């Protein structure tokens, strides 16, 4: 049986992945970059900060000074950090917050596997910090995702190794990092967004004990 489930956060815990891209979208707008539109978000969604912004000006073939790209990066987190103030338990996602509590009766570990450095301060948000058994500081990898890395240290820091690890996802850089993992991915989301090549649920509510169980059996 797995014995470890190594979840990502934005729009898989909560819908904080809305937030990024509203507050992406804005940031480019204000460079004078209109190409960020849902669609071209699926290219950001599991991308770090700064790889994010770098995708967006080179959507544009635009260059900005290095000084321009750390103020646009902090401002894009400024607005963000703003946005997110207001996240309760009331926003964490279906079916979430009891996966957690299944997964802990049953000894399953709990590890967080997000690149983003707001990650600590959501959970607190939410609730739901008392419920991880690791954090992966993301600061700490020598590579963000799609590289597996982050993943992997997940699995790590829960003493549980990849193979016998399931990853959540919503993004197509995250489902890539969970597979060079070694870990199993599922999906949340559309398959044509994510592929039709892994497990993909239409919303978390699909994300119950009895369904990951389901399809670790296969
Ligand atoms: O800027 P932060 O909060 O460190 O987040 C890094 C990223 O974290 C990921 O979880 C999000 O999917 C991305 O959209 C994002 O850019
Ligand atoms: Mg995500």
Same mark, same amino acid.
């Given at each position: =049986?797995?014995? $470890?489930?190594?979840?990502?956060?934005?729009?898989?815990?909560?819908?904080?992945? @809305?937030?990024?891209?509203?507050?992406?979208?804005?940031?480019?707008?204000?460079?004078?970059?209109?190409?960020?539109?849902?669609?071209?978000?699926?290219?950001?969604?599991?991308?770090?900060? #700064?790889?994010?912004?770098?995708?967006?000006?080179?959507?544009?073939?635009?260059?900005?000074?290095? @000084?321009?790209?750390? #103020?646009?990066?902090? &401002?894009?987190?400024?607005?963000?950090?703003? =946005?997110?103030?207001?996240?309760?338990?009331?926003?964490?996602?279906?079916?979430?917050?009891?996966?957690?509590?299944?997964?802990?009766?049953?000894?399953?570990?709990?590890?967080? $596997?997000?690149?983003?450095?707001?990650?600590?301060?959501?959970?607190?948000? =939410?609730?739901?910090?008392?419920?991880?058994? $690791?954090?992966?500081? +993301? $600061? @700490?990898?020598?590579?963000?995702?799609?590289?597996?890395?982050?993943?992997?240290?997940?699995?790590?820091?829960?003493?549980?190794?990849?193979?016998?690890?399931?990853?959540?996802?919503?993004?197509?850089?995250?489902?890539?990092?969970?597979?060079?993992?070694?870990?199993?991915?599922?999906?949340?989301? &559309? +398959?044509?967004?994510?592929?039709?090549?892994?497990?993909?649920?239409?919303?978390?509510?699909?994300?119950?004990? #009895?369904?990951?169980?389901?399809?670790?059996?296969?």
């Amino acid at each position: =049986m797995f014995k $470890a489930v190594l979840f990502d956060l934005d729009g898989v815990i909560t819908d904080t992945a @809305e937030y990024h891209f509203r507050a992406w979208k804005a940031l480019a707008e204000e460079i004078g970059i209109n190409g960020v539109d849902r669609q071209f978000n699926e290219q950001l969604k599991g991308v770090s900060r #700064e790889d994010s912004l770098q995708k967006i000006l080179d959507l544009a073939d635009k260059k900005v000074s290095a @000084e321009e790209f750390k #103020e646009l990066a902090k &401002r894009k987190n400024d607005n963000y950090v703003k =946005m997110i103030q207001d996240v309760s338990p009331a926003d964490v996602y279906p079916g979430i917050l009891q996966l957690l509590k299944d997964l802990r009766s049953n000894k399953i570990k709990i590890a967080l $596997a997000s690149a983003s450095k707001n990650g600590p301060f959501l959970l607190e948000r =939410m609730n739901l910090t008392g419920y991880f058994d $690791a954090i992966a500081d +993301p $600061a @700490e990898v020598a590579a963000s995702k799609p590289a597996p890395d982050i993943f992997i240290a997940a699995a790590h820091a829960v003493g549980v190794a990849p193979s016998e690890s399931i990853g959540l996802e919503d993004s197509q850089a995250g489902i890539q990092a969970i597979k060079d993992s070694g870990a199993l991915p599922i999906g949340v989301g &559309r +398959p044509e967004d994510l592929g039709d090549d892994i497990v993909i649920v239409p919303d978390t509510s699909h994300y119950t004990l #009895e369904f990951l169980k389901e399809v670790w059996l296969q």
